[PDB]
Design a protein around this motif. Structure first.
Motif, PDB file in Angstrom:
ATOM      1  N   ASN A 228       0.846  -1.189   0.000  1.00  0.00           N
ATOM      2  CA  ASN A 228       0.000   0.000   0.000  1.00  0.00           C
ATOM      3  C   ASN A 228       0.882   1.240   0.000  1.00  0.00           C
ATOM      4  O   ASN A 228       1.665   1.458   0.925  1.00  0.00           O
ATOM      5  CB  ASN A 228      -0.904   0.026   1.235  1.00  0.00           C
ATOM      6  N   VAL A 229       0.753   2.053  -1.039  1.00  0.00           N
ATOM      7  CA  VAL A 229       1.555   3.259  -1.143  1.00  0.00           C
ATOM      8  C   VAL A 229       0.689   4.509  -1.016  1.00  0.00           C
ATOM      9  O   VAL A 229       0.697   5.153   0.033  1.00  0.00           O
ATOM     10  CB  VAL A 229       2.350   3.275  -2.476  1.00  0.00           C
ATOM     11  N   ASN A 230      -0.065   4.845  -2.063  1.00  0.00           N
ATOM     12  CA  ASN A 230      -0.922   6.036  -2.044  1.00  0.00           C
ATOM     13  C   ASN A 230      -2.406   5.681  -2.132  1.00  0.00           C
ATOM     14  O   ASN A 230      -3.271   6.558  -2.075  1.00  0.00           O
ATOM     15  CB  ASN A 230      -0.584   6.971  -3.211  1.00  0.00           C
ATOM     16  N   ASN A 231      -2.693   4.394  -2.284  1.00  0.00           N
ATOM     17  CA  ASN A 231      -4.062   3.902  -2.411  1.00  0.00           C
ATOM     18  C   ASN A 231      -4.828   3.859  -1.098  1.00  0.00           C
ATOM     19  O   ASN A 231      -4.236   3.841  -0.019  1.00  0.00           O
ATOM     20  CB  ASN A 231      -4.038   2.489  -2.983  1.00  0.00           C
ATOM     21  N   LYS A 232      -6.155   3.844  -1.197  1.00  0.00           N
ATOM     22  CA  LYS A 232      -6.985   3.735  -0.006  1.00  0.00           C
ATOM     23  C   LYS A 232      -6.836   2.285   0.443  1.00  0.00           C
ATOM     24  O   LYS A 232      -6.743   1.374  -0.385  1.00  0.00           O
ATOM     25  CB  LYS A 232      -8.449   4.049  -0.324  1.00  0.00           C
ATOM     26  N   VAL A 233      -6.805   2.078   1.753  1.00  0.00           N
ATOM     27  CA  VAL A 233      -6.636   0.748   2.316  1.00  0.00           C
ATOM     28  C   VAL A 233      -7.822   0.364   3.195  1.00  0.00           C
ATOM     29  O   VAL A 233      -8.552   1.226   3.681  1.00  0.00           O
ATOM     30  CB  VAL A 233      -5.355   0.684   3.178  1.00  0.00           C
ATOM     31  N   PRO A 234      -8.034  -0.943   3.402  1.00  0.00           N
ATOM     32  CA  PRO A 234      -9.152  -1.381   4.245  1.00  0.00           C
ATOM     33  C   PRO A 234      -8.923  -0.976   5.703  1.00  0.00           C
ATOM     34  O   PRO A 234      -7.781  -0.859   6.147  1.00  0.00           O
ATOM     35  CB  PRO A 234      -9.165  -2.897   4.043  1.00  0.00           C
TER      36      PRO A 234
END
Ligand code: BT5
Ligand code: BT5
Lengths: 235, 229
Positions: free
Chosen positions: B131-137
């Motif tokens: 996970n870099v810049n993406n939305k995460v759970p």
């Protein structure tokens, strides 16, 4: 991870640290339309008639798989898409690239890029070689030599892919539109020598509705040149 | 045009704007060793037991084709190569990641990356999701959340690929080395639940098995499974 937002060209990109030739790989492999083949360097890069194309590290060597659903008589215009694409990208970097009919791009009359299209119908390979930061053959030039400084290769890649995608989409809708762009960015009004089965000299006047180069010989005779096994030289 | 200087991993890179799963593509296609498959987003990204791995734009979702001619017993350590590689990359960006046996990397106990290794006989596929810049759970984190600013995805890719290439080249010569790097970078000395039974995660053995000490004093060796901290 490249985050490309193009519709067709660049949906997939295959990168090689080194390859024999991106055009050969593209022609040979089973690839989806829009796939871009790019390499840091080519060991067997080639132009027309298997002439060699120097492809050292620092330049942009790539091929694009196309399956244009347009009449056969329009396929010859694919080379112009490549040439115009290169010109638009050079202008984005403030470099005055101009087209030498029908597949070369020059800056101050020195070759900075070349286009090679290969394709028997439903599968067309559009190959483009652009000198960016690489050393070049005597008489040629590069973006780096023109700007006086190194140019981010990836930025040039993104620019060109974006331009080509747009040009290709419009070509599918109106195959004739590209001719206007070529005409506006082509070297014209000068004396040229055409080399084929024999040769002749004249003023390169314009390109017709088919992309044929119109030459006016001193006698006033007009010749319409079809690009195939013929080369153009400036006088 | 990427100018990668790696020896094996990254000799070739196949990028997709969108794909079902980089691991699936890697398994079903003939690719040379070192070929990296990467995509902006995955529609069917998966973890263990076909679990779903959220892979929206902004993250690093890739798979690497390997064909290590090492003993069969060493193949189970490939997952650690991916995990340690991620940890090293995170450090380069000033982030302290810790490995949760056997395939997860956590930052302050929040999952930031996962590794999935799949062997297909003619090759081994090393899949990594970071996970870099993406939305995460909910409950997870990303490099962006940890640093408070967008991180250049290509920079992370270059860093990770360079680290993996080095780790892999050494692994081919000294297969044991990776375990020590794992011990130095994993969450141990804490109570965990294996799925079940609970106990203290003491260390990993020479085979990469998690050693658990149950309150009875019984010592169990875990070959695979989920670990809850
Ligand atoms: N790097 C370079 N820069 C400028 N001129 C060069 C050059 N390398 C060779 N030349 C000259 O340009 C001539 C070739 O000109 P032509 O007009 O025929 O041919 C071309 O201008 C087409 C070149 C297409 C190159 C791309 S690279 C990606 C893809 N993979 C390939 O193998 N090919 C394509 C040679 O005969 C040389 O004199
Ligand atoms: N984006 C995310 N960030 C943090 N945790 C996530 C997440 N997406 C899902 N999860 C959680 O993590 C669990 C999966 O954990 P596991 O330990 O089994 O599985 C993993 O941790 C391995 C994930 C491997 C992903 C890569 S992406 C590139 C390649 N292509 C693929 O299709 N897969 C590989 C799920 O059940 C969720 O609860």
């Amino acid at each position: 991870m490249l985050g490309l937002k193009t519709s067709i060209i660049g949906r997939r990109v295959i990168y090689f640290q080194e390859i024999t030739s991106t055009n050969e790989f593209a022609k040979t492999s089973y690839l989806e339309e829009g796939t871009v083949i790019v390499a840091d360097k080519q060991t067997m890069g080639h132009g027309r008639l298997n002439r060699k194309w120097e492809s050292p590290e620092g330049g942009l060597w790539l091929s694009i798989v196309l399956s244009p659903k347009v009449p056969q008589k329009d396929l010859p215009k694919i080379v112009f898409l490549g040439a115009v694409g290169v010109v638009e990208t050079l202008k984005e970097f403030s470099i005055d690239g101009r087209i030498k009919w029908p597949n070369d791009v020059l800056v101050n009359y020195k070759a900075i890029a070349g286009v090679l299209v290969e394709g028997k119908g439903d599968k067309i390979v559009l190959g483009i070689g652009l000198n960016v930061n690489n050393k070049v053959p005597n008489g040629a030039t590069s973006m780096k030599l023109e700007l006086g400084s190194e140019v981010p290769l990836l930025s040039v890649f993104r620019s060109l892919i974006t331009n080509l995608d747009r040009l290709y989409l419009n070509f599918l809708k109106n195959p004739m539109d590209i001719l206007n762009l070529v005409r506006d960015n082509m070297i014209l009004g000068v004396r040229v020598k055409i080399l084929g089965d024999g040769s002749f000299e004249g003023i390169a006047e314009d390109i017709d509705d088919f992309g044929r180069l119109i030459i006016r010989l001193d006698s006033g005779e007009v010749k319409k040149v079809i690009y195939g096994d013929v080369s153009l030289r400036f006088l």
